[PDB]
Amino acid sequence: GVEIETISPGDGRTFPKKGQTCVVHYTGMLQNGKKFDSSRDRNKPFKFRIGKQEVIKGFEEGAAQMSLGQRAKLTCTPDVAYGATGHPGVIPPNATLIFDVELLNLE
């Protein structure tokens, strides 16, 4: 269950499709926890395409429901990303994830 809470500005029409490589200034946040990931710290804003199961299931649906310039607020459920296993040392089992996502892309 991907729950979108968009901070408004953008265009609201430039929607992601297949065969489109896009750019996200994401920032990881643990619910009842601290940060764990930030593309803003590395200044290399994570160029990636859509559909090839690169990213987790929660980030995949939330990015497709956005448009250019928008700023959403993800709440990824445990069963779509890591809640069975958990990424070793970084993500505990049965964890619910928070993301600051801004789509500043091409295509």
UniProtKB/Swiss-Prot annotation:
Q: Does the keyword Cytoplasm apply?
A: yes
Q: Principal localization?
A: cytoplasm
Q: Which compartments does it reside in?
A: Cytoplasm; Sarcoplasmic reticulum
One annotated GO molecular function is: signaling receptor binding
> Coiled-coil intervals in this record?
none
Q: Which domain of life is it from?
A: Eukaryota
InterPro entries for the chain: FKBP-type_PPIase, PPIase_dom_sf, PPIase_FKBP_dom
What EC number is given for this enzyme?
Answer: 5.2.1.8
Q: In which tissues is it expressed?
A: Detected in heart muscle (at protein level). Isoform 1 and isoform 2 are ubiquitous with highest levels in brain and thymus.
User: What is the catalytic activity of this protein?
Assistant: [protein]-peptidylproline (omega=180) = [protein]-peptidylproline (omega=0)
Q: A Gene Ontology CC term for this entry?
A: cytoplasm
Q: Does the keyword Isomerase apply?
A: yes
**Which SUPFAM superfamilies is this protein grouped with?**
FKBP-like (SSF54534)
UniProt keyword annotations, A-Z = Cytoplasm, Isomerase, Rotamase, Sarcoplasmic reticulum
Q: How is its activity regulated?
A: Inhibited by both FK506 and rapamycin.
Name a single GO biological process: negative regulation of heart rate
Q: Quaternary arrangement and interactors, per the entry?
A: Identified in a complex composed of RYR2, FKBP1B, PKA catalytic subunit, PRKAR2A, AKAP6, and the protein phosphatases PP2A and PP1. Interacts directly with RYR2.
Q: What does this protein do?
A: Has the potential to contribute to the immunosuppressive and toxic effects of FK506 and rapamycin. PPIases accelerate the folding of proteins. It catalyzes the cis-trans isomerization of proline imidic peptide bonds in oligopeptides.
The Swiss-Prot or TrEMBL record describes its family as follows: Belongs to the FKBP-type PPIase family. FKBP1 subfamily.
Indicate what this protein is called per its UniProt record: Peptidyl-prolyl cis-trans isomerase FKBP1B
Q: What is this organism's lineage?
A: Eukaryota, Metazoa, Chordata, Craniata, Vertebrata
Name the gene: FKBP1B
